[PDB]
mmCIF file of C-alpha atoms (C1' of nucleotides) and ligand atoms in Angstrom:
data_model
loop_
_atom_site.group_PDB
_atom_site.id
_atom_site.type_symbol
_atom_site.label_atom_id
_atom_site.label_comp_id
_atom_site.label_asym_id
_atom_site.label_seq_id
_atom_site.Cartn_x
_atom_site.Cartn_y
_atom_site.Cartn_z
ATOM 1 C CA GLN A 13 82.657 89.233 104.995
ATOM 2 C CA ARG A 14 82.600 89.192 102.234
ATOM 3 C CA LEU A 15 83.847 85.475 101.980
ATOM 4 C CA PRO A 16 80.460 83.787 101.002
ATOM 5 C CA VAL A 17 79.919 85.861 97.756
ATOM 6 C CA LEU A 18 83.943 85.095 96.857
ATOM 7 C CA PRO A 19 83.224 82.504 93.781
ATOM 8 C CA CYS A 20 86.541 80.063 94.256
ATOM 9 C CA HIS A 21 85.113 78.598 97.937
ATOM 10 C CA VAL A 22 81.545 78.669 97.714
ATOM 11 C CA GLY A 23 81.286 75.028 96.976
ATOM 12 C CA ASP A 24 83.297 71.628 96.508
ATOM 13 C CA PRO A 25 86.711 72.648 95.536
ATOM 14 C CA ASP A 26 87.429 69.642 94.046
ATOM 15 C CA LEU A 27 85.742 70.488 90.975
ATOM 16 C CA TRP A 28 88.732 73.284 89.680
ATOM 17 C CA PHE A 29 90.974 70.615 89.027
ATOM 18 C CA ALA A 30 88.798 67.945 86.982
ATOM 19 C CA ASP A 31 90.737 66.624 84.189
ATOM 20 C CA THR A 32 87.954 67.317 81.601
ATOM 21 C CA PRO A 33 88.108 70.314 79.180
ATOM 22 C CA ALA A 34 83.570 70.498 79.401
ATOM 23 C CA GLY A 35 84.001 70.399 83.444
ATOM 24 C CA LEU A 36 86.233 73.243 84.325
ATOM 25 C CA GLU A 37 84.612 75.256 81.949
ATOM 26 C CA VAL A 38 81.673 76.371 84.572
ATOM 27 C CA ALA A 39 84.418 76.750 86.985
ATOM 28 C CA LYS A 40 86.428 78.749 84.684
ATOM 29 C CA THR A 41 83.159 81.035 84.036
ATOM 30 C CA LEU A 42 82.232 81.582 87.501
ATOM 31 C CA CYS A 43 85.118 83.202 88.352
ATOM 32 C CA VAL A 44 83.277 86.146 86.024
ATOM 33 C CA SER A 45 81.852 87.604 88.697
ATOM 34 C CA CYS A 46 85.083 87.276 91.405
ATOM 35 C CA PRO A 47 85.580 90.708 92.694
ATOM 36 C CA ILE A 48 89.602 89.732 92.979
ATOM 37 C CA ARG A 49 90.450 88.574 89.473
ATOM 38 C CA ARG A 50 93.057 91.357 88.924
ATOM 39 C CA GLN A 51 95.316 90.096 92.343
ATOM 40 C CA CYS A 52 94.181 86.641 91.846
ATOM 41 C CA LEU A 53 95.420 86.652 88.377
ATOM 42 C CA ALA A 54 98.606 88.692 89.315
ATOM 43 C CA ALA A 55 99.700 85.975 92.270
ATOM 44 C CA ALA A 56 99.060 83.106 89.930
ATOM 45 C CA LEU A 57 101.120 84.370 87.187
ATOM 46 C CA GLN A 58 103.809 85.518 89.283
ATOM 47 C CA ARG A 59 104.593 82.901 91.569
ATOM 48 C CA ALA A 60 103.562 80.619 88.739
ATOM 49 C CA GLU A 61 101.584 77.675 89.105
ATOM 50 C CA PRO A 62 100.809 74.591 87.830
ATOM 51 C CA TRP A 63 97.904 73.581 87.761
ATOM 52 C CA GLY A 64 94.244 74.268 88.139
ATOM 53 C CA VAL A 65 91.651 76.918 87.158
ATOM 54 C CA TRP A 66 93.308 80.390 88.928
ATOM 55 C CA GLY A 67 91.753 84.117 87.638
ATOM 56 C CA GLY A 68 88.955 82.823 85.795
ATOM 57 C CA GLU A 69 91.571 81.008 83.734
ATOM 58 C CA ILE A 70 93.680 77.896 83.297
ATOM 59 C CA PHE A 71 96.812 76.954 83.417
ATOM 60 C CA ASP A 72 99.706 74.651 81.988
ATOM 61 C CA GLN A 73 102.802 74.407 84.310
ATOM 62 C CA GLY A 74 103.879 78.024 83.018
ATOM 63 C CA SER A 75 101.907 79.662 81.437
ATOM 64 C CA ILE A 76 98.227 80.506 80.725
ATOM 65 C CA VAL A 77 96.107 77.980 77.795
ATOM 66 C CA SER A 78 93.366 79.108 75.635
ATOM 67 C CA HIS A 79 91.156 75.646 76.492
ATOM 68 C CA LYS A 80 92.601 72.473 77.508
ATOM 69 C CA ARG A 81 93.332 70.034 74.996
ATOM 70 C CA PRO A 82 90.821 67.089 74.946
ATOM 71 C CA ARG A 83 92.137 63.089 74.930
ATOM 72 C CA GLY A 84 92.444 62.147 71.861
ATOM 73 C CA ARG A 85 93.297 62.985 68.302
ATOM 74 C CA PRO A 86 92.729 66.650 67.114
ATOM 75 C CA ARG A 87 91.233 67.810 64.765
ATOM 76 C CA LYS A 88 92.256 68.491 61.226
ATOM 77 C "C1'" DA B 1 128.355 68.885 208.807
ATOM 78 C "C1'" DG B 2 125.156 68.906 204.035
ATOM 79 C "C1'" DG B 3 121.373 68.950 200.564
ATOM 80 C "C1'" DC B 4 116.764 69.655 198.267
ATOM 81 C "C1'" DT B 5 113.165 72.781 198.569
ATOM 82 C "C1'" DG B 6 110.882 77.102 198.415
ATOM 83 C "C1'" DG B 7 110.155 81.614 195.915
ATOM 84 C "C1'" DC B 8 113.472 84.919 193.745
ATOM 85 C "C1'" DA B 9 115.773 86.786 189.824
ATOM 86 C "C1'" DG B 10 117.555 86.818 185.535
ATOM 87 C "C1'" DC B 11 116.683 85.399 180.391
ATOM 88 C "C1'" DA B 12 114.886 82.527 175.242
ATOM 89 C "C1'" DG B 13 111.236 82.950 172.380
ATOM 90 C "C1'" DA B 14 106.821 84.040 169.632
ATOM 91 C "C1'" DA B 15 103.071 87.694 168.491
ATOM 92 C "C1'" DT B 16 100.979 92.231 167.225
ATOM 93 C "C1'" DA B 17 150.795 92.075 140.928
ATOM 94 C "C1'" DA B 18 152.810 90.197 137.728
ATOM 95 C "C1'" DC B 19 155.371 86.093 134.652
ATOM 96 C "C1'" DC B 20 155.345 81.299 131.961
ATOM 97 C "C1'" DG B 21 153.973 76.677 130.165
ATOM 98 C "C1'" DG B 22 150.780 73.900 128.891
ATOM 99 C "C1'" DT B 23 146.125 72.148 126.616
ATOM 100 C "C1'" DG B 24 141.942 71.975 124.937
ATOM 101 C "C1'" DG B 25 138.654 74.468 123.270
ATOM 102 C "C1'" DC B 26 136.941 77.859 119.050
ATOM 103 C "C1'" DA B 27 135.959 79.861 114.921
ATOM 104 C "C1'" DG B 28 136.937 80.048 110.138
ATOM 105 C "C1'" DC B 29 138.375 78.193 106.188
ATOM 106 C "C1'" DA B 30 139.083 75.541 101.835
ATOM 107 C "C1'" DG B 31 138.519 71.294 100.493
ATOM 108 C "C1'" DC B 32 137.025 66.268 99.540
ATOM 109 C "C1'" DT B 33 133.337 64.870 99.156
ATOM 110 C "C1'" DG B 34 127.885 62.815 99.080
ATOM 111 C "C1'" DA B 35 123.204 63.263 99.513
ATOM 112 C "C1'" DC B 36 119.880 65.731 97.227
ATOM 113 C "C1'" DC B 37 116.876 68.907 95.056
ATOM 114 C "C1'" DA B 38 116.099 71.190 90.568
ATOM 115 C "C1'" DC B 39 114.916 72.012 86.723
ATOM 116 C "C1'" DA B 40 114.745 70.050 82.488
ATOM 117 C "C1'" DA B 41 114.534 67.456 78.855
ATOM 118 C "C1'" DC B 42 113.422 62.795 76.903
ATOM 119 C "C1'" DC B 43 111.391 58.805 76.472
ATOM 120 C "C1'" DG B 44 107.648 54.479 77.139
ATOM 121 C "C1'" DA B 45 103.726 52.627 77.278
ATOM 122 C "C1'" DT B 46 98.179 54.114 77.124
ATOM 123 C "C1'" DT B 47 94.252 55.055 75.575
ATOM 124 C "C1'" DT B 48 91.573 57.672 72.844
ATOM 125 C "C1'" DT B 49 90.426 58.331 68.787
ATOM 126 C "C1'" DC B 50 90.519 61.003 64.561
ATOM 127 C "C1'" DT B 51 92.659 60.418 59.618
ATOM 128 C "C1'" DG B 52 93.741 58.128 56.393
ATOM 129 C "C1'" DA B 53 93.541 55.070 52.201
ATOM 130 C "C1'" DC B 54 91.153 49.604 51.115
ATOM 131 C "C1'" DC B 55 87.800 47.364 47.337
HETATM 132 S S1 LIG C 1 90.646 81.808 90.607
HETATM 133 FE FE1 LIG C 1 89.769 83.287 90.278
HETATM 134 S S2 LIG C 1 87.155 82.858 91.469
HETATM 135 FE FE2 LIG C 1 88.700 81.609 92.276
HETATM 136 S S3 LIG C 1 89.427 82.688 94.015
HETATM 137 FE FE3 LIG C 1 90.684 83.451 92.545
HETATM 138 S S4 LIG C 1 90.028 85.425 91.422
HETATM 139 FE FE4 LIG C 1 88.140 84.275 92.780
#
DNA sequence: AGGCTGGCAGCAGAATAACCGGTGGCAGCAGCTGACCACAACCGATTTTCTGACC
């Protein structure tokens, strides 16, 4: 079916929870071409997923952050 | 004098209406819990790593 075209499970699944701001960036933008962004993002927002890339967007424990804040002192 | 030998005959089996007492089960439910999620916050370093000034 359309399973190998689905960009979620094409490669290694441990990529999409890597705890670097730059590592998961290609994981987030790899769901640009995903055919099911609407329903996946809708399910992720309704069930309140606390981790990882969902619907081509990252998640905190309840909501969506724009980009994950890096380790260290943030920029003034 | 009967007996035990002989067929002869006959048969089983197989195939193709109430009471009373008591006693234990049981289900329903307030009412101690008491362990348990469970959010939800709040801190305890921890490490990085800028940020800010020092001379
Ligand atoms: S997170 Fe995005 S890319 Fe991955 S399966 Fe869901 S919609 Fe597709």
